[PDB]
Symmetry: C3
Subunit: 35 residues, 3 copies
């Protein structure tokens, strides 16, 4: 349960968080587009 | 401090930034009613 | 490199990714604003 392993666990969560946020950004950007 | 602390600080900063961007996209959704 | 280096490098990349998303978000903020 080293600090290393704990941070590797946290980075896995960050990859997940970024995945969904990216997709949501893309969805809103597509919806609205340019004028 | 230390090399490991610098890393922990960056991981904290990452979690913070992500939360901020989540919040931002939430506010954008309100502006467009989505 | 080392276990520790490899994690350091993944964190930098994640900071790169977050900067990019911040800019995409900022762009969308302009797209849904008044013009």
């Amino acid at each position: 349960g080293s600090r290393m392993k704990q941070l590797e666990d946290k980075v896995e969560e960050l990859l997940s968080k970024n995945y969904h946020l990216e997709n949501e950004i893309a969805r809103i950007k597509k919806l609205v587009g340019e004028r």
